[PDB]
């Protein structure tokens, strides 16, 4: 979770330049917290 939030804030500093389409992906990567934050989903994924 800390790694994801850190990457999003790194995107918050620098620029989504049109000559390098990398940094939009770290902004889109924020969604995966929606699994890790719910403890029930953490339990089920750890059971898998």
């Amino acid at each position: 979770d800390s790694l994801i939030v850190t990457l999003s804030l790194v995107e918050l500093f620098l620029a989504d330049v049109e000559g390098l389409s990398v940094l939009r992906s770290f902004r889109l990567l924020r969604v995966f917290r929606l699994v890790t934050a719910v403890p029930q989903m953490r339990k089920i994924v750890s059971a898998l």
């Binding site: 500093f13 620098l14 620029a15 989504d16 330049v17 390098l20």
Partner: peptide, 30 residues
């Protein structure tokens, strides 16, 4: 003067050298 980094840029006050106006001053790849 040119806009210092981390300041809300606009059409009339551009940023300084090495930055792109994207509603504020943002740096570029090293």
């Amino acid at each position: 003067y040119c806009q210092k980094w981390m300041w809300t840029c606009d059409s009339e006050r551009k940023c300084c050298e090495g930055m792109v106006c994207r509603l504020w001053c943002k740096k570029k790849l090293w």
